[PDB]
């Protein structure tokens, strides 16, 4: 019903609807010195659906709750793009991060804004990891596919560590213990013709049994990861619809701000202009 322009002493301003002394309806808000811009819908003091543009031209397009990115949304940050769920200002739980320049992506679960839980990481050269992540790193069990070698086994702080099996499409395989992406501990190596090799890099049959067990586990962990990746893909697609809804409210807010304050400079378009 009412609205207008309110100028803050730091150079920013709110221009849009208000009701009961709170931002309401649609509105555009700029930060200190007019730097940074939210444009979208509001409900009694809180953003709902809209676009935040940083001075660099980077953007968040999607849903908000209690003053934070929350729900579905898409973040464009130059080196990469994130689409999917947001929880109280952080990426997650389910979503996809995709490189702007290459094929590299991560699809799966996130915790505290980091790759964490289960997912599929696809690398620049087209190879994959599928399985467990902890705090951004391959940690637990998972399957490392190359571009046709494949590792199935244990991981610790982003490196093969513990029991694991490495088998190339030539038959060259290693079953045993590992340390830092390097054969280390008890474990043999089978040749393509069949020639078995060194024991230490009796108790080797134990390390091979532990290796083949961890490879079996890793294959199950990759299966879980594949299910999580599929859900992350569905939530990234829902976030494409969230971004479009956010831009719809942003454009309504730009129009209103234009009517309410024809002279107020909306910085968002110029930010995005050459990005």
């Amino acid at each position: 019903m009412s609205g207008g322009r309110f100028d803050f002493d730091d150079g920013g301003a709110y221009c849009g609807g208000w009701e009961g002394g709170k931002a309401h309806g649609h509105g555009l808000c700029t930060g200190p010195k007019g730097q940074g811009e939210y444009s979208g819908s509001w409900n009694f003091g809180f953003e709902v659906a809209g676009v935040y543009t940083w001075p660099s031209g980077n953007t968040f397009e999607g849903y908000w709750s209690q003053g934070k990115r929350h729900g579905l949304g898409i973040e464009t940050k130059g080196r990469w793009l994130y689409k999917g769920e947001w929880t109280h200002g952080f990426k997650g739980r389910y979503g996809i991060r995709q490189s702007s320049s290459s094929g590299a992506k991560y699809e799966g679960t996130w915790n505290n804004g980091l790759q964490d839980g289960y997912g599929t990481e696809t690398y620049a050269d087209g190879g994959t990891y599928q399985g467990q992540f902890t705090n951004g790193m391959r940690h637990g069990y998972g399957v490392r596919q190359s571009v046709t070698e494949t590792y199935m086994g244990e991981w610790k702080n982003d490196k093969r560590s513990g029991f694991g099996v490495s088998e190339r499409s030539s038959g060259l395989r290693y079953e045993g213990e590992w340390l830092d992406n390097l054969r280390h501990g008890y474990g043999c190596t089978t040749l393509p013709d069949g020639h078995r090799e060194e024991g230490k890099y009796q108790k080797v049959e134990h390390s091979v049994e532990g290796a083949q067990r961890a490879a079996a586990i890793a294959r199950q962990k990759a299966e879980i990861a594949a299910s999580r990746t599929s859900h992350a893909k569905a939530k990234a697609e829902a976030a494409e619809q969230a971004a479009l809804a956010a831009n719809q409210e942003s454009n309504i807010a730009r129009t209103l701000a234009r009517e309410l304050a024809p002279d107020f400079y909306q910085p968002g378009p110029e930010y995005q202009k050459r990005r």
Binding site: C29, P32, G36, G45, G67, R69, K77
Partner: peptide
């Protein structure tokens, strides 16, 4: 890069 959001008045409290 961090999101600026103003406190009070027109805006609901956050934390």
């Amino acid at each position: 890069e961090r999101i600026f959001r103003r406190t009070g008045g027109l805006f609901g409290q956050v934390d």
